Amino acid sequence: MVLSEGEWQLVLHVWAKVEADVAGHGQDILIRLFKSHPETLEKFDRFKHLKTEAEMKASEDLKKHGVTVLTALGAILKKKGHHEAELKPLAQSHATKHKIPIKYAEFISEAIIHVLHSRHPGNFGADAQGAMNKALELFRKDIAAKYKELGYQG
Numbered sequence: 001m002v003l004s005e006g007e008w009q010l011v012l013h014v015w016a017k018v019e020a021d022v023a024g025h026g027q028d029i030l031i032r033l034f035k036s037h038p039e040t041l042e043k044f045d046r047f048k049h050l051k052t053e054a055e056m057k058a059s060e061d062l063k064k065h066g067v068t069v070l071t072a073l074g075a076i077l078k079k080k081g082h083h084e085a086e087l088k089p090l091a092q093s094h095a096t097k098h099k100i101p102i103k104y105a106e107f108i109s110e111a112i113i114h115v116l117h118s119r120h121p122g123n124f125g126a127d128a129q130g131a132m133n134k135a136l137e138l139f140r141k142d143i144a145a146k147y148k149e150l151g152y153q154g
């Protein structure tokens with residue numbers, strides 16, 4: 001798949017807003033994922049112990065990892081489809097080291113869309129959400145293909 005330039009512009013316009021507060025958005029997205037799909041929390045030996053939303057919100061470590069996640073995702077999105085080098089090390093660590101099944105990438109995709117819709121309603125109308133979804137689908141498709149190449153499947 002290929003996004004058009006107009007779709008990329010909708011994606012990067014809302015992303016510019018996200019980047020005004022990377023830590024806050026990172027926290028919100030990981031917490032949404034762990035509340036909506038509790039099984040994902042189990043893959044994080046670092047965070048597995050957190051029992052409640054209050055505890056997640058107070059963890060400086062979780063916030064730091066949220067920044068790490070969104071910074072890496074932001075770098076991929078800014079490539080506007082030319083992301084093969086950025087994707088390679090991420091595919092390898094998530095497939096071989098962390099052992100994350102590809103279905104969980106769908107779950108975090110959902111979490112990102114939820115938080116952008118909640119925080120940025122005026123810059124995340126239906127057309128902008130559709131463009132963000134296509135971007136995330138492109139990312140998932142390419143990561144799935146690399147999983148296969150690496151011997152995992154997802």
Ligand code: HEM
Nearest residue numbers: 040043044046068069072073090093094098100104105108
């Ligand atoms: C937008 C998708 C994602 C991005 C951009 C992302 C990015 C990253 C980055 C940059 C790291 C640190 C370096 C590395 O280990 O590769 C990391 C670590 C990790 N990721 Fe992801 N990740 C994503 C989705 C997920 C999902 C869906 C899960 C699990 C449900 C996951 C599980 C982990 C784990 C367990 C670690 C190691 C944490 C630690 O113990 O420090 N990732 N991720």
